[PDB]
């Protein structure tokens, strides 16, 4: 109820807000920050505090606990994020849904973190004042991911953030880089076609002045998805050319970024490059914000990889608990693997609708070819000369006349490495392959060895930097 | 003896007669008083469906949950509790080591009858801490194994197996290893490693005494078939077929006697026919055999590979006759196997020659490197990003 809730809400707010604030004030020190911001800060603000303890809308108290921003517009984020449905898109609060301010209680104490309202609020050209107001901004809009709320940030409730920003800190941008991600999402979830660009574009200009890779990088990615879904293909295509993405970027922003690029490549007809980026994306973030995203990654994963020429097992996919999204997908994997052209394309044509939202749909057409190609590949390697009639029956080709032409097209690329005799009706294997040779096994070993180096350097560089920092500052 | 429960259990699980088998299957738990664990146990057992309990129907009508199962459970538990109390209290007044030990062995044996896996570990440890005869100690572990197999989840048995391993070494009793060996084989048939299951089953047949076995006759029939899966023809011919040991073990094999003959003769046609039959009669019956796919693949590879390995040429007509399988079918099955290239053969349908490359060179050893190499490639990278964040 209301008396108990208010107390509970202030005490949780204060602890979380004070810590968050304390890191920016110290100033960005990159090595130390990277561990602090990734695991700790983001996770406590998002999952741990808001959801647990009293209700899941601590926000009416949150405004009164500490200053959001000086106008009553930010103070009325009890009317721009509880306004829609019943207390936003989250559990029912006991706290008052009111215009201007909720209640009238001011537990802003004399404490700096706890911030009195005329005192911090002014949106200074000094970098300090925007920086605390943004820390409070972070917690409200990071809820958006948990909630899946729509149009309670599309209107002023994070359009407001632009006004707070004046000069901005370099230190500010690393944390602000997380807030920006959430601004896009609210419009993008419903697939609203309202002005995502203005706010993100505004943030790009400051971030370049400050020299913080994380903030400029994170905007390029969000932007890329907004446009693709919208069917503003041209903007999305151009944007990729800036390319910046630091290692101190968050695990969710990386997985999102890899997926988006993966789509752009795949239609251009870089099946080879597309496959690689998308596979990396599933792997790099196991995370917890990733869970929601991973299902999307699995949809694309199965279609791209099959076009490139490799087959996976239906068995692999079924085992994880994201199983529910893989289910239509099991039919497709099997179709390519058995060698069943007719089953594979028909299923995919109807399925094509779902992909259109993503803009993956242009690929679905090209997919008819790949099953026949996968099929030919198993037959070519296996045999020496096998007759044309045998290949037509197994692969499930249309007729014997279809079968000669199609097998030929695969052959040209060279991954099959055969010749087909049209007037003699057999295919011959140019493969007489073996790695029993002179140098050839080293070549096989070489790729593994190259890849290891990238791991070794990344490891070495990273390993020393966190313990030396803790001895330097607070060692706990 | 408790091992009989398992034998019966495979039959309602597989399709070969569902309904009738269920009553009989249900009775052995009915006496033991299995109730608390029973509802949870049915779900796990399934890997070819059909529940051994009344808590689900899959393929046919299920037998009902008898009242006797509940009544025996309550009566046995009440008794065990009365007995144990006098002993635990007496233990303090008297020698700590002796009195508690005798009490604990009994208490454990009843907990295992319910099938409480947790109650079996707690009961076991106290006895071990105190003085206890090495033979007597080791015997106890057998019950804990029987419940894991009963449950027939791969995870649960792996935990039991780790404990069993530490314990056998301390006591040093060989009579006890034999009973342990059987449980170990029973789990092995259940997964993808029949190769391992074959060794365990063979050693035990030669010298066994009838304790912890479901029926010697069924067990001997089964043992020979498993040896084939692991063992290719040059080993198989000597050990099983012509060997001294098979007579000593005693004969109940004939469907299998013909099976071994077909590989030795170099007449494969009858091998394939028998393969199909062996899946229906042995495997289904038995509770243990999931991922049936492995069994089939290996057996079929064995036949193909032995002919091909010996011969770099055969003509197509001869090759087709010997194999006794249809032409499209011989090709398709092989196609999977050739990719791995431990066989590594081509088939002509224009030259009418089936060629075998037969690498025993750098090719052979290198191909395996690649497959292992893929698994290592994903793991290392995944580990690197998780730690960085």
């Amino acid at each position: 109820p209301a008396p108990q809730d208010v107390e509970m809400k202030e005490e949780a707010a204060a602890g979380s807000g004070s810590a968050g604030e304390g890191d920016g004030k110290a100033a960005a020190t990159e090595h130390s920050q990277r561990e602090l911001d990734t695991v700790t800060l983001e996770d406590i603000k998002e999952h741990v505090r808001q959801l647990e303890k009293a209700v899941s809308g601590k926000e009416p108290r949150f405004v009164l606990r500490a200053l959001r921003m000086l106008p009553s517009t930010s103070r009325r984020l009890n009317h721009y994020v509880l306004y829609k449905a019943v207390h936003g898109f989250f559990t029912s609060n006991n706290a008052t849904r009111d215009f201007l301010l909720p209640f009238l209680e001011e537990p802003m104490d004399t404490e700096a973190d706890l911030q009195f309202r005329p005192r911090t609020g002014k949106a200074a050209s000094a970098p300090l004042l925007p920086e605390v107001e943004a820390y409070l901004q972070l917690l409200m809009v990071i809820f958006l991911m948990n909630s899946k709320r729509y149009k309670e940030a599309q209107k002023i409730s994070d359009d407001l953030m632009q006004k707070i920003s004046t000069q901005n800190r370099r230190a500010l941008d690393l944390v602000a880089a997380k807030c920006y991600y959430y601004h896009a999402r609210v419009y993008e979830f419903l697939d609203k076609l309202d002005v995502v660009r203005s706010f993100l574009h505004a943030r790009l200009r400051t971030a370049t002045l400050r020299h913080d890779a994380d903030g400029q990088a994170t905007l390029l990615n969000l932007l890329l998805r907004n446009y693709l879904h919208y069917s503003l293909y041209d903007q999305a295509e151009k944007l990729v050319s800036k390319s910046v993405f630091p290692e101190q970027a968050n695990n969710n922003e990386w997985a999102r970024y890899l997926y988006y690029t993966g789509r752009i490549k795949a239609i251009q007809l870089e099946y080879s490059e597309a496959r690689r980026t998308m596979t990396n994306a599933l792997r790099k973030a196991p995370q917890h914000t990733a869970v929601g995203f991973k299902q999307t990654v699995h949809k694309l994963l199965i279609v791209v990889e099959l076009l490139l020429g490799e087959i996976p097992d239906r068995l692999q996919f079924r085992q994880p608990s994201l199983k529910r999204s893989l289910m239509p997908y099991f039919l497709l994997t099997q179709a390519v693997r058995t060698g069943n052209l007719a089953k594979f394309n028909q299923v995919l044509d109807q399925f094509g609708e779902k992909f259109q939202t993503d803009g993956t749909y242009t690929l679905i057409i090209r997919l008819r070819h790949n099953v026949i190609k996968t099929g030919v590949r198993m037959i070519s390697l296996s045999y020496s000369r096998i007759s044309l009639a045998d290949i037509a029956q197994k692969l499930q080709l249309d007729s014997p006349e279809d079968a000669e032409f199609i097998v030929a097209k695969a052959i040209r690329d060279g991954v099959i490495e055969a010749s087909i005799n049209h007037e003699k009706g057999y295919v011959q294997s140019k493969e007489m392959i073996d790695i029993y040779s002179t140098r050839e096994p080293q070549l096989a070993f070489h790729q593994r060895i190259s890849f290891c180096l990238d791991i070794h350097n990344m490891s070495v560089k990273a390993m020393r930097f966190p313990p030396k920092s803790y001895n330097k500052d607070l060692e706990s | 003896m408790p091992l009989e429960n398992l034998e019966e259990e495979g039959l309602p699980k597989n399709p070969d007669l569902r309904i009738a088998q269920l009553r009989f299957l249900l009775s052995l738990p009915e006496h033991r008083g299995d109730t608390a664990v029973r509802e949870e146990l049915m779900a796990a057992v399934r890997e070819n469906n059909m529940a051994p309990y009344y808590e689900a129907l899959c393929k046919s009508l299920d037998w009902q949950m008898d009242m006797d199962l509940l009544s025996k459970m309550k009566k046995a538990n009440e008794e065990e509790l009365k007995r144990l109390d006098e002993e635990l209290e007496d233990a303090e007044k008297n020698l700590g080591e002796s009195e508690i030990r005798d009490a604990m062995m009994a208490k454990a044996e009843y907990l295992c009858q319910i099938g409480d896996k947790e109650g079996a570990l707690t009961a076991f440890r106290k006895t071990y801490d105190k003085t206890v005869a090495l033979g007597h100690r080791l015997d106890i572990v057998f019950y804990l194994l029987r419940i894991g197999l009963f449950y027939m989840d791969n995870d649960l048995i792996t935990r039991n197996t780790e404990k069993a391993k530490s314990l056998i070494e301390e006591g040093g009793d060989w009579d006890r290893r034999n009973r342990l060996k059987v449980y170990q084989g029973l789990y092995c048939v259940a997964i993808r490693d029949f190769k391992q299951a074959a060794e365990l089953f063979l050693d035990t047949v030669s010298t066994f005494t009838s304790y912890e076995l479901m029926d010697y006759k069924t067990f001997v029939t089964y043992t020979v078939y498993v040896s084939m899966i692991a063992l290719e023809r040059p080993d198989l011919r000597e050990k099983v077929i012509k060997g001294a040991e098979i007579l000593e073990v005693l004969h109940s094999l004939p469907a299998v006697r013909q099976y071994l003959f077909s590989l030795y003769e170099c007449r494969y046609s009858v091998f394939f026919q028998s393969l199909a039959v062996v899946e229906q009669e042995m495997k289904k019956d038995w509770l243990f055999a999931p991922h049936y796919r492995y069994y089939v693949r290996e057996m079929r590879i064995h036949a193909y590979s032995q002919l091909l390995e010996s011969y770099r040429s055969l003509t197509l007509g001869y090759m087709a006759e010997a194999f006794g399988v249809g032409v499209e079918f011989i090709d398709q099955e092989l196609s999977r196997f050739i990719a791995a290239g431990r066989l590594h053969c081509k088939i002509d349908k224009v030259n009418e020659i089936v060629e075998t490359n037969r690498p025993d060179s750098k090719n052979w050893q290198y191909q395996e490197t690649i497959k292992k190499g893929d698994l290592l490639l994903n793991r290392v990278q995944k580990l690197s990003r998780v730690i960085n964040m």
Binding site: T338 | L275, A276, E279, Y292, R293, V296, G324, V325, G326
Partner: peptide, 24 residues
Amino acid sequence: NVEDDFSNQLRAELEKHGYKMETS
């Protein structure tokens, strides 16, 4: 095709009978 073993039970029986009558 999830597992080859179900299909294979029918295949081996069927394939032998036809093949035998004809060639072997």
